[PDB]
Amino acid sequence: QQREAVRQLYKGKKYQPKDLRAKKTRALRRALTKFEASQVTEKQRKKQIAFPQRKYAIKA
């Protein structure tokens, strides 16, 4: 009950108590997030839009 009350008190806050944060692994918590890992440069994004990998086949 008390932990859930603290969780609802902190809901949506940027900084949570460390015991309320997810444990996972030290290395997993040090890894880049999906957003940071997915960041690309403007030049690379333009190239990806202009020349994506195509779907083709060998028949005719």
Partner 1 sequence: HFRKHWQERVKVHFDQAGKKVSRRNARATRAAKIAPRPLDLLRPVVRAPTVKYNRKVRAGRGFTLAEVKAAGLTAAYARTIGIAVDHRRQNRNQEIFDANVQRLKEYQSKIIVFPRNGKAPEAEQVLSAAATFPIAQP
Partner 2 sequence: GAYKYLEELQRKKQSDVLRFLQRVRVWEYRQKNVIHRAARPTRPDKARRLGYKAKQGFVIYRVRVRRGNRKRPVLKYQRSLRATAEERVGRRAANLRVLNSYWVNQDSTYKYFEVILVDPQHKAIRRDARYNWICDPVHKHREARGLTATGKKSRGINKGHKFNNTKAGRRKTWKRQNTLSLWRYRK
Partner RNA sequence: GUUUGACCUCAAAUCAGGUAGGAGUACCCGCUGAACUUAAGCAUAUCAAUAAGCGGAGGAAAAGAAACCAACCGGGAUUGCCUUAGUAACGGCGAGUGAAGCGGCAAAAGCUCAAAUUUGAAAUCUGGUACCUUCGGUGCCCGAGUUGUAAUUUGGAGAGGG
Partner RNA sequence: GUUCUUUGUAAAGUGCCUUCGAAGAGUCGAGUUGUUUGGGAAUGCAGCUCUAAGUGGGUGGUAAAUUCCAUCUAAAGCUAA
Q: Which residues make up the interface to partner 2 (CB under 8 A)?
A: 27, 30-32, 35-37, 39-41, 44
Q: Smallest Cα–Cα separation from 20: which of 45, 3, 41?
A: 3
CA distance 52 to 6: 48
Residue 29 interacts with which of partner 2, partner 1, RNA, none, CB < 5 to 8 Å by class? RNA
Residue 15 interacts with which of partner 1, partner 2, RNA, none, CB < 5 to 8 Å by class? RNA
CA distance 33 to 9: 25
Residues that bind RNA (CB under 7 A): 12, 14-15, 27, 29-30, 33-36, 41-44, 46-47, 49-50
